[PDB]
Each structure stands twice: as structure tokens, then as C-alpha cells.
Design a protein around this ligand. Structure first.
Ligand SMILES: N#CCc1ccc(Nc2nc(Nc3cc(C4CC4)[nH]n3)c3ccccc3n2)cc1
Length: 264
């Protein structure tokens, strides 16, 4: 029972409200040391802590920061608190109506920033999507849920690169594919991708070259980025470093003549 410095005593934690239901446990919102507001992911035990394992190694402003870990049962995992909730609920909720392409591309740029770090650290997320991005104050966005994240050595198919879904080949490039899918959730205010298609149909279609078309009002340049992310060859997909820089400069280098519309 040799715990590390991340370990803490349950007595220093006290969940106040609940934040959501979960497959492997819940997620509460409480107080740490009675002074710092935190989020807690409650509830194999050692397997459940693998997200903390990787979260201990990752440190970046665009990744939800791990604070402490309770290695006993009920096994907890304290992290930074994001006041706005998931991007998915954010996009479809009361807030979604006012977000325009400029704010949406900035949020994408931030996510691309967190993933570029994950890229440099030679890790893989494996479950990148809006439900796993958290929003905070000032439209700050951060990557979260590293339950499946690992050091590169059925998953939600609609967000998963075909080679990862079929052959188990999860690389940073399969996260890029997911990124492209995440871009459509941003540009459509969080609609589930591949409308009307069911998993089996999506898998077959994609394999046959099918790709989602340009969302209404989204510039062709942005949709082309999405298409580079969905290239059949994992290697011809852009890096996150590229995605971060392209998105950050988007309104000056790519769409300088951009004009706001009714939805984007
Ligand atoms: N990890 C993961 C997936 C995942 C799944 C569901 C949730 N729902 C969640 N979360 C909130 N705030 C949070 C959450 C976090 C850390 C992830 C635990 N910090 N701040 C949150 C804050 C306010 C309102 C609703 C909220 N609803 C959050 C995350």
C-alpha cells in the first residue's frame, strides 16, 4: 500500500452536489480542504485509477488538472472544477444560440492546443469528443476524461477513426480523425454526427469513402480541414500543431473576408 504524493485523506473532501450519472461511477462537485472548490469522479479499482495515472503525468492549461487521488474505496479522483459543464451541453443549451464562427473556432483552437500537448507527450486520448471537453469562465475549454488515454506503445464509432474501430490501431492520428468529427459538433451546435445513420451504416459508408458534407454556413476552408482530418491514410492527416496554428490564425490567414451570418 505504497501511495504517492497525490494521495490524500477522504476527510479533506466533501462532495456537495451531483454533476452527472456515469457508466463506471458518478461525478460530483465539492470542496477540498474546505477552501478550494473541486470536482470529483466517484464510482476494477486499480483499472478505474488509470485515468489518474495518466492525469498525473499530464500538465497543461488546456487539460483539466488532476488535484488529488483517493486510492481506497469508494475510489475518488479530485480535479479542477469547470463551471460551465461539458461542451456538448454548452453547444445545445441556451448558450449555443449566440455562439458564432469566431467563438467556435477559438474553442476549437484551445482544444487543438490541449491535444498538441498530448501529442508532444506521445500519448493518445482515444475518446475525444464534445461530451469530453469542459467549458469554464471566459469560454475557456479543456480536454478531460482520460479513462482510455494511454502512452502509445466498441468505442463510439461515429467519432472513432475507422482503423481504430476495426483493427484497434489507436494513434494520435486517430485522435485527429475524432477532432474533425468534433469540428462538426461545433459547427452544428452539437448535433450527433452522420444524422440518420446507425453505427453499422456509418462504418460501411466511411470505409467506402463517404464523408460528412459542409455544415450549413460553415466556410469551405473549415470543411476542408475536417476532410484532411478524415483522410483514409492515418499518416496524411494533419498534426495538432498544424491544427492549432491554422485555427488560431484562421480569421486573418484563411477567411479574412469572413462575414457573420444567422447561425455562424
Ligand atoms: N471527465 C469527464 C467527463 C465528464 C462528464 C460529465 C461532466 N459533467 C459536468 N461537469 C462539470 N464540471 C466539471 C467536471 C469536471 C471534471 C470532469 C470531472 N470539472 N468540472 C459541470 C459543471 C457545472 C455544471 C454541469 C457539469 N457537468 C463532466 C465531465
Amino acid at each position: 500500500l505504497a501511495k504517492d504524493a497525490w494521495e490524500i485523506p477522504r476527510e479533506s473532501l466533501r462532495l456537495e452536489v451531483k454533476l452527472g450519472q456515469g457508466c463506471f461511477g458518478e461525478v460530483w462537485m465539492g470542496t477540498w480542504n474546505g477552501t478550494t472548490r473541486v470536482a470529483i469522479k466517484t464510482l476494477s479499482p486499480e483499472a478505474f485509477l488509470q485515468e489518474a495515472q495518466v492525469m498525473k503525468k499530464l500538465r497543461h492549461e488546456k487539460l483539466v488538472q488532476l488535484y488529488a487521488v483517493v486510492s481506497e474505496e469508494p475510489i475518488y479522483i479530485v480535479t479542477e472544477y469547470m463551471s460551465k459543464g461539458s461542451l456538448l451541453d454548452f453547444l445545445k443549451g441556451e448558450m449555443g444560440k449566440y455562439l458564432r464562427l469566431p467563438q467556435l473556432v477559438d474553442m476549437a483552437a484551445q482544444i487543438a492546443s490541449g491535444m498538441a500537448y498530448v501529442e508532444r507527450m506521445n500519448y493518445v486520448h482515444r475518446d475525444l469528443r464534445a461530451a469530453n471537453i469542459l467549458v469554464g469562465e471566459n469560454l475557456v475549454c479543456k480536454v478531460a476524461d482520460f479513462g482510455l488515454a494511454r502512452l502509445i506503445e466498441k468505442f463510439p464509432i461515429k467519432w472513432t477513426a475507422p482503423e481504430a474501430a476495426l483493427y484497434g490501431r489507436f494513434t494520435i492520428k486517430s485522435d485527429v480523425w475524432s477532432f474533425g468529427i468534433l469540428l462538426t459538433e461545433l459547427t452544428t451546435k452539437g448535433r450527433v454526427p452522420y444524422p440518420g445513420m446507425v453505427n453499422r451504416e456509418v462504418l460501411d459508408q466511411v470505409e467506402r469513402g463517404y464523408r460528412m458534407p459542409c455544415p450549413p454556413e460553415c466556410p469551405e476552408s473549415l470543411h476542408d480541414l475536417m476532410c484532411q482530418c478524415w483522410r483514409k491514410d492515418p499518416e496524411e492527416r494533419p498534426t495538432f500543431e498544424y491544427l492549432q496554428a491554422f485555427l488560431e490564425d484562421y480569421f486573418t490567414s484563411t477567411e479574412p473576408q469572413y462575414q457573420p451570418g444567422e447561425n455562424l
